[PDB]
Write a protein that binds this ligand. Structure first.
Ligand SMILES: CC(=O)N[C@@H]1[C@@H](O)[C@H](O[C@@H]2O[C@H](CO)[C@@H](O[C@@H]3O[C@H](CO)[C@@H](O)[C@H](O)[C@H]3NC(C)=O)[C@H](O)[C@H]2NC(C)=O)[C@@H](CO)O[C@H]1O
Ligand SMILES: CC(=O)N[C@@H]1[C@@H](O)[C@H](O[C@@H]2O[C@H](CO)[C@@H](O[C@@H]3O[C@H](CO)[C@@H](O)[C@H](O)[C@H]3NC(C)=O)[C@H](O)[C@H]2NC(C)=O)[C@@H](CO)O[C@H]1O
Ligand SMILES: [Cl-]
Ligand SMILES: [Zn+2]
Ligand SMILES: [Zn+2]
Ligand SMILES: [Zn+2]
Ligand SMILES: [Zn+2]
Ligand SMILES: [Zn+2]
Ligand SMILES: [Zn+2]
Lengths: 165, 165
């Protein structure tokens, strides 16, 4: 539309080119997607330049994904979205907890949950930013789960959708 | 309407009613501000309803403040901004590091620094959000430094300025 698509093949996904951990698959409609078999360090990362976007526009970034029959260790994860130039020296990723595989129980339950897209894929909002003049530099965003003690499994990554709000 | 102003009186500021830690003051034009004499738990918190705000608009939220001549232990602090309903159970504050008293000495120094406003007060951006249709509830925000080993001093809090980008 007036936004940008980053297909999974163009994201930075650690371990994604080692078949023991992730499997690249072609699926309808002739797209490549990345299926996580098992990983202890899950990091799905992308970065864009705001100089290329429409000015005076708020944008949201969404991870488009699916789950297998048996997702493991992915009830919660860490989403992050920031301007690269706003990272204080020595600060960490400093993200926010979102839900990935957990289903909203009762209508009063708080948190950011995924939901179904027109194309049958799920999406979770990683964050939002305002593009003023396209001069504030790049925006990086990721969904990660870097608990060394847990094997994450069963997410299928399609890409990042970047849409005007 | 077009954004919102939270006076210091309507922010939740820890210990602010204790004259050993904060000193309430009146300054031109007949406004009450909270001067920080000394505190170890610094927390300045405020909350708005998005239903009040102009719709389909991106909003930035700033703490408006000044520094005394000899501020203490305020080079950095933690900013947070989030939709109340998006906070997952058990999640902490999950904020970002920003600079308060530190001066941007390098043109290529990274981080959010304060900006000198038209009216001579400083402002620090706590966060940003898109208001769609006013149906996503409250937004909460804070600046805090809760290192129990340091005594913060020298910030004069005027209020929160919620403004369209
Ligand atoms: C409890 C325990 O040790 N479990 C083991 C897992 O830790 C281990 O997963 C690997 O963990 C290391 C960190 O401990 C990961 O290294 C990180 O890799 C990322 C991406 O390349 C890099 O950015 C980080 O700097 C790096 N961390 C450090 C500290 O250097 C590594 O990627 C994990 N490997 C996988 C496949 O997820 C697994 C597998 O060895 O075994 C557990 O028993
Ligand atoms: C002993 C030391 O190294 N430093 C002392 C400071 O810790 C102390 O400041 C007080 O610290 C406590 C704990 O960090 C603060 O209590 C917390 O207050 C928040 C807000 O009200 C509350 O939500 C927490 O539950 C509560 N935690 C606990 C464990 O009680 C307290 O607010 C701080 N007080 C002030 C005035 O900053 C100062 C002063 O007592 O002395 C240092 O020596
Ligand atoms: Cl780079
Ligand atoms: Zn959506
Ligand atoms: Zn409210
Ligand atoms: Zn210090
Ligand atoms: Zn909350
Ligand atoms: Zn200005
Ligand atoms: Zn909504």
């Amino acid at each position: 539309g007036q936004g940008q698509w980053i297909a999974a093949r163009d994201l930075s996904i650690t371990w994604v080119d080692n078949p023991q951990y992730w499997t690249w698959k072609t699926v309808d409609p002739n797209i490549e997607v990345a299926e996580l078999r098992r990983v202890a360090w899950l990091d799905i990362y992308g970065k864009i330049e705001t100089k290329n976007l429409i000015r005076k526009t708020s944008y949201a970034v969404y991870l488009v994904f699916k789950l297998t029959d048996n997702p493991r260790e992915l009830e919660r994860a860490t989403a992050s979205l920031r301007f690269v130039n706003e990272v204080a020296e020595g600060a960490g990723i400093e993200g926010t907890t979102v839900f990935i595989s957990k289903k909203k129980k009762l209508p009063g339950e708080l948190g950011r949950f995924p939901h179904l897209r027109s194309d049958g894929w799920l999406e979770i909002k990683l964050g939002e930013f305002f593009n003023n003049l396209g001069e504030d530099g790049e925006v990086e965003m990721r969904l990660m789960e870097i608990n060394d003690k847990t094997w994450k499994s069963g997410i299928i990554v399609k890409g990042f959708d970047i849409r005007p709000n």
